[PDB]
Amino acid sequence: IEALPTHIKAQVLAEALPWLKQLHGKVVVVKYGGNAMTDDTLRRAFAADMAFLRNCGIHPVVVHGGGPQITAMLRRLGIEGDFKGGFRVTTPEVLDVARMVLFGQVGRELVNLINAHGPYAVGITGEDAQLFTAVRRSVTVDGVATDIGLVGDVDQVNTAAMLDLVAAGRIPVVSTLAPDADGVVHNINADTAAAAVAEALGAEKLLMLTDIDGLYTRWPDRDSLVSEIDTGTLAQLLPTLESGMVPKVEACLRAVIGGVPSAHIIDGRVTHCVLVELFTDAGTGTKVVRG
Amino acid sequence: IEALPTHIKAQVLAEALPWLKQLHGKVVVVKYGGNAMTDDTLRRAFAADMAFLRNCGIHPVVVHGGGPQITAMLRRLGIEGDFKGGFRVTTPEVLDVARMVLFGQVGRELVNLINAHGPYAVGITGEDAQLFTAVRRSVTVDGVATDIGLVGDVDQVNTAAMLDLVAAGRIPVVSTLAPDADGVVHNINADTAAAAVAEALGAEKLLMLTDIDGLYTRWPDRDSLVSEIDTGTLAQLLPTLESGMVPKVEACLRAVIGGVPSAHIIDGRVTHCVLVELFTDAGTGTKVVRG
Amino acid sequence: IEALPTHIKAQVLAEALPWLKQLHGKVVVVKYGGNAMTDDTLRRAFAADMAFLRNCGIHPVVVHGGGPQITAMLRRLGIEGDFKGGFRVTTPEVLDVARMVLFGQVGRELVNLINAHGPYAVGITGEDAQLFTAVRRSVTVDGVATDIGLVGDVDQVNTAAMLDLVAAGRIPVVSTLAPDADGVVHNINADTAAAAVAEALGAEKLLMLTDIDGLYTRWPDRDSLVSEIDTGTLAQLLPTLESGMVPKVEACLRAVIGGVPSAHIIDGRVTHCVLVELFTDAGTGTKVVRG
Amino acid sequence: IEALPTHIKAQVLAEALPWLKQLHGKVVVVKYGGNAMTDDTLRRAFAADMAFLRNCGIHPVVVHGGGPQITAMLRRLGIEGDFKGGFRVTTPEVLDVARMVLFGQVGRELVNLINAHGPYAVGITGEDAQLFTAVRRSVTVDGVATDIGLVGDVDQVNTAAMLDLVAAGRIPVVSTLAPDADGVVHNINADTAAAAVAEALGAEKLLMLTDIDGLYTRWPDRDSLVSEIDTGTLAQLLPTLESGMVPKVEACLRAVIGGVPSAHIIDGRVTHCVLVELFTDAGTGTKVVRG
Amino acid sequence: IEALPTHIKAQVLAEALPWLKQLHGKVVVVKYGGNAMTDDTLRRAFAADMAFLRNCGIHPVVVHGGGPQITAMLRRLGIEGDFKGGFRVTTPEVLDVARMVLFGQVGRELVNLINAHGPYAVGITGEDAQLFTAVRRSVTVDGVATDIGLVGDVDQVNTAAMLDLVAAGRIPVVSTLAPDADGVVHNINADTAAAAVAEALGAEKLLMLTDIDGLYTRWPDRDSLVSEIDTGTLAQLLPTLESGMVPKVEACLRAVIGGVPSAHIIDGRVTHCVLVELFTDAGTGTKVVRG
Amino acid sequence: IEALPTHIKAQVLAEALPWLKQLHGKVVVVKYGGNAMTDDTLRRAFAADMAFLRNCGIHPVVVHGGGPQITAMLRRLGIEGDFKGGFRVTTPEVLDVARMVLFGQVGRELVNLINAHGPYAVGITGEDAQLFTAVRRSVTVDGVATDIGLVGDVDQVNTAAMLDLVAAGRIPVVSTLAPDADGVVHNINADTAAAAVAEALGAEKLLMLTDIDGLYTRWPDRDSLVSEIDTGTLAQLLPTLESGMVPKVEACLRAVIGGVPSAHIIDGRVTHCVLVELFTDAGTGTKVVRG
Ligand SMILES: COc1cc2cc[nH]c2cc1C(F)(F)F
Ligand SMILES: COc1cc2cc[nH]c2cc1C(F)(F)F
Ligand SMILES: COc1cc2cc[nH]c2cc1C(F)(F)F
């Protein structure tokens, strides 16, 4: 990076300006998961980019997953799973584990990484200050809607209290657990929770970190990779994508139809992917806009 | 409670007034542990008293322990302990468990209990917003000061940021983990952390919930139970008490010599012990004052 | 009160919590008169309950009468009364006396009693800061509407300026005099003024202290005493009650139809009646709600 | 006033500017009494000048007396006086009358007069919000210090709370009664109370309205009238003035030695004397400055 | 001014009060030009009256012209003019001169004059903080609408940012230059810009200083001078007035139809004309009101 | 810039982070002159970097010169110069020109350039709101201190009012003219004014744009170019540098001895020199620190 001439270093920074202007004072919700969460270089870069946004006057909000870590802890505790379709049933016991891992392990690692740069990160769940509630959700296996326990969707969000937190200069790191109307805590899918938080907060962008270059229309045709697409036609392509990018795509449509100006599916295996997606035009991701 | 005449119900409430006046707008730090944490009626009463304080314009701050729950989780995970003296060595592995249990299990239960009354509780540790730091602590076994791993005392406290949280009408529920100056998270004894938080916040009172009637000078002489004592003579009685009330007593002296007007050791096995200690003169506890 | 066990003292305080939650941060307007104003123990208790509300974060507003004290001062000054029906005509001279007694004697006693607990009470009339205006009122004697001088109803209220006063932590003590649109000060009935203030301020409750157990439907049948009634049927019972509880009942209907969630007619001869009505379920009063 | 040319009307207003600049945003305490209080044209002019100051962004504070009105009310009530020296003894009964007349009659008239111009005036005494306290004072008759009942000097003043009131755009009208440390209300001499309020509030000027042209050094020599004098030499002239201007002079010295930049003894028999003293150089009054 | 009795000095100041009340806390926009700008006594008086308004809590906003000064500078620089009709074409070169003279000479003189009284004046143009924009304007010569270069009308105004400036206690002195939507700065007629600023700011009055006694209906008939007129009939008299008072009249109609309660054409050759127009009833000007 | 790989674009932006953290919420004063002011590409880049800083939450303050533009305007106006030493005497006439050019031409161009990015720039001089004063300065020619007219140094600065302006999100663009204590406006050297503003505002950095690579100790030895130097030894090198970098060096010493953490002499001929100096380590400039 030292053999690179100085006048091109200048140019790269100057080309950030249109996006610094767009994002200044705005909320950006980031779904964090995948390899961006498991490799130590990626992780550290992610935390530094969160500090970057904050030290530009941008208001990042982090929503994290943790599927594989929950599973490993269940196996360590010898908790036998029940499975309907390909879904583990979330008993009261599985939820206690899920909450303890998400909030007391996975969330903690990110908060500490970010806080290496300053007193920025703060961890929360829907339980704290009743920041958001959940509604129990069913799944459809082999055509029939079925109960798989204490798993929900975000119901309502405390928009005011959450925007207080970010105006104080803090970076919320959200673990997706929240209680229903009777106080019963549910585990929420991180991808959908992020889209819901983004719409409730009036975010300027939603970013989804995933382990992909971007959205392929006809995977695996390499020339099917797309850089921008509207919600109308993306909704039509939904039943034709692999099972893994379904929830990431649904989040994007749900957020952009909710009024979030754009959602982005970006490559979490790229170091500093947030910086490249937000402050350069050389992004590999896929941008979703309404239409 | 219905056969009790109405004019004595009036008198009991009216006698709360001198203490409502003393505590209005003030911080009260409460160490929560023991049976007040394990029995479901006690627990529920505790959470309701926290809501009580808040709905009087008092600012409670809860610091909780969780020793036995950490141990049970270590045994469930098959994590073999190392012991110097009677102290488990806190390896990096034991800390991850301690943090996950304290913050992702024990803290969560209290937050949800309190939040049944309103959007009040919020959980935090020293890691969040760098609210407090830790300094690694040694112990003295058989006369020699020895390392027992990632266990510390509270070093510095972010007084301003924490008092912001309570002025917003929130009830912090603190899990005693905090990073040292190099970002390495340590587990802090809950009793001492509570005394440190109380002095840093300028609390009007520190309350220590324990499984005792109060401080006995010559346990087990029933007529040795004391209701008030000064720090000077309490410091002299310290080497003569059973090992369990040592840390609770040290917390009280350290807090009251730090300027907290009074610390109280009260009976956590009594339903609504906080209400009786703060709003009545029939408290069984022991009050510590400077002298 | 000392022979009463401690665990029932706890229970009485804990049962206040649902009402502390309901009233926290809310305005409660209290009409003060009758024996609660003339007996020194009752008075002192009343003032202490006003301090109680304030030291819970509740915002009391006191409206007081003083009929008998005006009369005694008129007799002391040798001011001969004119009477139409059973109404003294309020000449300019009678008003000067009424204002001087209400604001410079009766209001002063309450302010000083309350202020024994802190710098809380502040006395005012509609004249100060133009806080409310009056409209001259007629009475109907023997079927004909007749002028009885400078006696009015509350016309408009300065809601903003009055709610400033209470947010400053002050307890307004209102003497019911106010000028009309031409600057001419009138004396307003205290019961009706209290209902008007309560509706203008968005009070959560209106309390009317009177010298009765509660509203009897068929006085004197002891089994006609009612604990709750709606405005629709209370309006039907109005022409059938003794002349003294008419104005207290009209105040309640007018306030609750104005949107005040409930008005209460409570026994001012009971020490700490405000505490028992607001923080216990053993109230003897009568609650009025809309319907 | 119509035959007066327009370009001299311009000049008179333009010459106000140096004093508008000096007084803008500043407190001016005005002792109001004498004929400025009893004649209806003077009174009305006084109230209009208070509105003038307020509508310039000046913060007037009015302190009023009422000696003769108290006396007339005592005679009307048949209250026999006790006299030591030339001082009526202020029994508990005399005080109730004094307070009722000052606050419920004399203060009310001024508040209503001022409020004809806007919602400006608000009446208060030391009792309200504990705005100031009193200390019982003795008098010296025939060489010996003697008790004359519930008469005091201003002890402490709630500077913060009072300056809140004026920043809200209100004009306090103070009746000089205040409680001592035991809650016992005393009557304070209005002239001295005004000097105390002026020093506690950091007033820019104290104005004393009196029934005189100004301070005569050798009354009645017409050529002894002075327009400015320092505190050092005014203190020397004190034992040589008629009994009536003693308290007005003592107020001025006490205020100006307290740091009030200047005190002024002005002719209350002159219509709009406040306007002429503050906004013109043709004042007849006497200015006191430190030296 | 010294031979004038003191009690009439009082009366002149007291008669200001109804207008101090009307204007307190309100915006007053003043178009400044003509002889009030060129004679040193008039100028100094003008600046002192601006300080007067400010030291009454009134918020003046000054808009200035400078036609003749631009012309003299063009002649000094040897810049040959192009003329269509009687209009100089404003080339890019003429604008640079116009802006440099208006903002860097004429505006500076006024700011310094006002600032002799305090830190009040601040100079601005539409360019600063994008406070207002311009739209290019045509003129009609001999019946045809024609381009005369970079001359415009005020397009949009930043009402919020400008009212911030005055709430800070500052007196804006506006030079009428502003950029169009493409960033191209235009010169705006000062009379029309003042009417636009007055309507955008919700001014209570617009004052137009001119070199006339007032509006004559049938100039030169001396008995045709009018003191008040409504917009409806003033619009009918527009095509019948001399070319010089056309733009001043159009400003008044445009402002008063925009909701400004009244616009005034006053004699700038009168020392302290602003003081006489605003604070006396002996104004020579012409008041415009809607109708 | 497109053939450059994306992962190095990421790295260049990520390496900005330590300096975004250092500068966030801080004042940076920038002296703007030289070729950075005359070439249209440099100029545009400069204005974009000012918008960059602002859209990072940094508070830039621009101080500009304009020596050559004043000279050209004097020659255009045929104003014959008087010269003592190599200094033009600043007569009242020369100052009017200097002020008109600096504030009404040179300042305007920068404000409009910056404002192409948003409503950021606002132009001011010491005259506006009395933001800073000047003290007349002498020069020493051939050994003797001599008067060269209305040329000064910055005397006092209104730190509070200026920091208000930047907290509002504005970018002040300062033209260095200010009045002395008698209201007489002087022209101040831009380099020294910038150092004075930087110390008065508590700036984190002072940047001096010049037409040089950096400070050469032994110009022209290419290997004498320095990247960092302390004030102690820089003060010793002062009498040994070419006449042009003297004032730039004096500014740096005066600012850094005034407590500004570092001053920087950077190459204004480099496009985006501000971005490279502040956000990269490949700066060519010279950093001055205390020592
Ligand atoms: C302002 O609200 C908060 C502040 C802090 C500071 C540390 N943790 C916090 C959690 C919150 C919460 F949860 F209320 F949003
Ligand atoms: C804020 O307004 C007030 C404050 C105080 C403090 C003592 N008496 C007061 C009366 C008022 C009033 F009357 F404006 F409400
Ligand atoms: C608050 O805004 C301003 C303040 C000051 C102080 C001096 N000049 C100022 C110009 C402005 C502006 F231009 F933003 F209105």
Short mmCIF file of C-alpha atoms in Angstrom, two decimals, chain F residues 104-214:
data_model
loop_
_atom_site.label_atom_id
_atom_site.label_comp_id
_atom_site.label_asym_id
_atom_site.label_seq_id
_atom_site.Cartn_x
_atom_site.Cartn_y
_atom_site.Cartn_z
CA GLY F 104 -16.67 40.92 -1.62
CA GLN F 105 -14.66 38.99 -4.25
CA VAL F 106 -12.15 36.44 -2.91
CA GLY F 107 -14.27 35.26 0.04
CA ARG F 108 -17.37 35.07 -2.18
CA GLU F 109 -15.72 32.73 -4.67
CA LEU F 110 -14.77 30.23 -1.96
CA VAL F 111 -18.20 30.39 -0.24
CA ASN F 112 -19.89 29.62 -3.55
CA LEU F 113 -17.52 26.80 -4.38
CA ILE F 114 -18.05 25.12 -1.05
CA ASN F 115 -21.76 25.70 -1.20
CA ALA F 116 -22.01 23.66 -4.32
CA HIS F 117 -21.91 20.72 -1.92
CA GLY F 118 -24.39 22.05 0.56
CA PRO F 119 -25.51 24.94 2.68
CA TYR F 120 -22.21 25.07 4.50
CA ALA F 121 -20.10 28.16 3.98
CA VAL F 122 -20.64 31.52 5.57
CA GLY F 123 -18.39 34.51 5.13
CA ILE F 124 -17.27 36.79 7.89
CA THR F 125 -14.75 39.31 9.02
CA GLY F 126 -13.82 40.62 12.42
CA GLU F 127 -16.45 43.34 11.89
CA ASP F 128 -19.40 40.93 11.93
CA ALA F 129 -20.79 40.39 15.43
CA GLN F 130 -17.47 41.86 16.69
CA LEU F 131 -16.01 38.40 16.14
CA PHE F 132 -12.43 39.60 16.55
CA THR F 133 -10.66 42.91 17.05
CA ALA F 134 -7.35 44.19 15.68
CA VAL F 135 -4.38 46.09 17.12
CA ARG F 136 -2.40 48.32 14.77
CA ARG F 137 1.01 46.85 13.93
CA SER F 138 4.32 48.41 12.97
CA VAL F 139 7.02 46.97 10.74
CA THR F 140 10.76 47.32 11.05
CA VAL F 141 12.50 48.57 7.89
CA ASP F 142 16.29 49.04 7.85
CA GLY F 143 16.26 48.64 11.64
CA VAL F 144 13.50 51.11 12.60
CA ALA F 145 9.88 50.36 13.49
CA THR F 146 7.62 52.23 11.06
CA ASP F 147 3.91 52.85 10.48
CA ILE F 148 2.48 51.48 7.23
CA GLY F 149 -1.11 52.45 7.92
CA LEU F 150 -4.22 50.41 8.79
CA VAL F 151 -2.56 47.01 9.11
CA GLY F 152 -2.83 45.06 12.33
CA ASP F 153 -2.60 41.79 14.22
CA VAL F 154 -5.61 39.98 15.68
CA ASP F 155 -6.18 41.35 19.18
CA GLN F 156 -9.06 39.48 20.85
CA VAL F 157 -11.35 36.78 19.47
CA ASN F 158 -14.99 35.98 20.30
CA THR F 159 -14.33 32.28 20.92
CA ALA F 160 -17.87 31.50 22.10
CA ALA F 161 -19.74 33.13 19.19
CA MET F 162 -17.43 31.57 16.61
CA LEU F 163 -17.80 28.04 18.05
CA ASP F 164 -21.58 28.56 17.96
CA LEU F 165 -21.28 29.06 14.22
CA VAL F 166 -19.45 25.78 13.66
CA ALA F 167 -21.71 23.74 15.98
CA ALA F 168 -24.57 24.85 13.71
CA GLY F 169 -22.80 22.85 10.96
CA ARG F 170 -21.41 25.93 9.20
CA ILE F 171 -18.02 26.50 7.68
CA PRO F 172 -16.74 29.96 8.42
CA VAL F 173 -14.73 31.57 5.66
CA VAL F 174 -12.82 34.38 7.22
CA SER F 175 -11.65 37.54 5.50
CA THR F 176 -9.01 39.10 7.71
CA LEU F 177 -10.28 42.55 8.45
CA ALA F 178 -11.22 43.71 11.88
CA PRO F 179 -11.76 46.87 13.76
CA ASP F 180 -9.50 48.23 16.44
CA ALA F 181 -10.84 49.41 19.81
CA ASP F 182 -12.03 52.70 18.25
CA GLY F 183 -14.00 50.94 15.50
CA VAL F 184 -11.34 51.59 12.84
CA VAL F 185 -11.07 48.59 10.54
CA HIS F 186 -7.57 47.23 9.81
CA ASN F 187 -6.28 44.62 7.35
CA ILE F 188 -4.58 41.66 9.08
CA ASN F 189 -1.99 39.33 7.55
CA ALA F 190 -3.86 36.11 6.77
CA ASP F 191 -1.11 33.76 7.97
CA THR F 192 -0.92 35.33 11.43
CA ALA F 193 -4.70 35.73 11.71
CA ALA F 194 -5.06 31.98 11.07
CA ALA F 195 -2.65 31.10 13.87
CA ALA F 196 -4.54 33.45 16.21
CA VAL F 197 -7.95 32.01 15.30
CA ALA F 198 -6.57 28.49 15.74
CA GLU F 199 -5.30 29.18 19.26
CA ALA F 200 -8.45 31.07 20.29
CA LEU F 201 -10.68 28.23 19.08
CA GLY F 202 -8.71 25.38 20.63
CA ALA F 203 -8.15 23.86 17.19
CA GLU F 204 -6.73 20.36 16.99
CA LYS F 205 -4.66 21.29 13.91
CA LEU F 206 -3.62 24.33 11.92
CA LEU F 207 -3.00 23.73 8.20
CA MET F 208 -1.06 26.29 6.10
CA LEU F 209 -1.44 25.84 2.34
CA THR F 210 1.64 27.18 0.52
CA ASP F 211 3.39 26.76 -2.83
CA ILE F 212 6.16 24.49 -1.48
CA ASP F 213 6.86 20.79 -0.91
CA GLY F 214 7.61 21.54 2.73
#
